[PDB]
Amino acid sequence: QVQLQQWGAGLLKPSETLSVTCAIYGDSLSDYSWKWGVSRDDYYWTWIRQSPGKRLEWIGEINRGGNTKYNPSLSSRVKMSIDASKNQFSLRMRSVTDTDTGIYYCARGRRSRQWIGDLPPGNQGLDVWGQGTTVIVSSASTKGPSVFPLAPSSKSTSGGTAALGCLVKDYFPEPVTVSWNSGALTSGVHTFPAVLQSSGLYSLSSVVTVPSSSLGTQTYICNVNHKPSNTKVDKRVEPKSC
Amino acid sequence: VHEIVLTQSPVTLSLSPGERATLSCRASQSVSSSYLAWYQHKPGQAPRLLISDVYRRASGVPDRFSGSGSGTEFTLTISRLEPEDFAIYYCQQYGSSPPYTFGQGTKVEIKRTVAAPSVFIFPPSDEQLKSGTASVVCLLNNFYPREAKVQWKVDNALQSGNSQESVTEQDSKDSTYSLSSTLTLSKADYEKHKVYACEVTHQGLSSPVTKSFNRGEC
């Protein structure tokens, strides 16, 4: 069982240098003994990335010997290093701009023409992936969200059921977590994916449907947590007439 | 620009569990069958290799996943769909010539009966108005299919360029969608009008549904 783990997160201003690392477990890079399967020189340690509204992009690869191969769209800004003293390999991307925001995965590609005994499944592909490191490039500074109450009214009521919510607006960066009544309310909750406004800040909504008759009995609080800004906000959503 | 370009079809496949799924991946120029790979991807989870080399299954891939191709058109087939198989599927050329580009992806969706959305509207709050901004929210709750049209009207005038939309993933319970649309104005632009309306068009609605309010009511 060969696994990859990615540590850290990315928060960069434009023109800065991104540096991401990946650690391998379940296999050694300083093991030069080929007695079964494929040679450890046929492994190509790969960086891939994906932006929210785009397809996956092969960033590049480096092998155990140091030979690198870079996507020509990134090759001018990309450097790739590897070290078997820690079984790790890293990517350095210079001159980052807003276009480089996304999820960065490390993977193991396998390209073998020769083997001893059996060719393990997963040749000619990326057979082992990391979970993904989030990287955000923006001119915006870290900002905690403003939480405004989407108050229930006659215009948000249908058959004894009323909708009520929280507008989590103007925060940076992702992500935020939203709970209701300190987690004691889970049924009928919808938290929407954040949308990036032209101002560079994120905004989203979290709504829940409750019994109408309970609006005079129950008190509803939304708990918004933004870890990058170290903020937690508890907002009470009080009913209104409109 | 020597790069091979892959294109997947359809963009979204809507089927039920137990049915047969087929996903197509067309290359701009012929690629050897030995260098075409398929991956499965679920949101928040790492991508998983399915088919590689000459249509050979990767580690821990069940027998219901098969692959075929001719060099220019390739096909990933799922004989019967288990619930855990609804996700995104990508194709990639790997091993032929770098860069090893991907397709745009195909989404596999659960096909259910047509469900009309519940339309609700939320006016701005005094907290936000005291900051110089006004956001009106329109929520469409539990609908299918995902195709829905949300329009903002201010004094019976259609708005453009000051609203944002967001849709949730498919629900693991009732397999429906939910949409939130936020219309944002300045306090001045907001208070210069009276009627704010959200008009919704959906397959499950005979005629469009309008949820409106007067700024003087709130």
Author numbering:
A (entry chain H): 1 to 31, 31A, 31B, 31C, 31D, 31E, 31F, 31G, ...
B (entry chain L): -1 to 27, 27A, 28 to 95, 95A, 96 to 214
Paper text:
In this study, we investigated a donor who developed a family of potent HIV bnAbs with different lengths of an insertion in a critical framework region following infection with two founder viruses that were closely related and underwent extensive recombination. The bnAb lineage is defined by a CDRH3 length of 22 amino acids (aa), an IGHV4–34*01/IGHJ6*02 heavy chain (HC) and an IGKV3–20*01/IGKJ2*01 light chain (LC) gene. A greatly reduced ability for donor plasma to neutralize N332A Env-mutated pseudoviruses of different clades identified the V3-glycan bnAb site as the major target for PC39 neutralization breadth. Ab crystal structures show an extended CDRH1 that can help stabilize the CDRH3.
(c) Ribbon representation of PC39-50I Fab with 11aa CDRH1 insertion. Structures of all three 11aa-insertion Fabs reveal an extended CDRH1 that provides support to and stabilizes the long 22aa CDRH3 (Kabat numbering) of the lineage. The similarity in backbone conformation (root-mean-square deviation (RMSD) = 0.3Å) and neutralization potency (0.10 vs. 0.09 respectively) of mAbs 17A and 50I suggests that the preconfigured interface in these structures is conserved across 33 months of Ab maturation. However, neutralization breadth was shown to increase during this time highlighting the importance of continued SHM. When compared to other V3-glycan bnAb Fab structures, 11aa-insertion mAb HCs (17A, 23D and 50I) most closely resemble PGT135, which also has an insertion in CDRH1, while the LCs of these mAbs are more similar to that of PCDN-38B, with an RMSD of 0.48 Å (S12(A) Fig). The glycine at position G100C found in the WIGEL motif is present in the UCA and only retained in 11aa-insertion Abs. This sequence provides a glycine hinge to the unique mature bnAb CDRH3 structure.
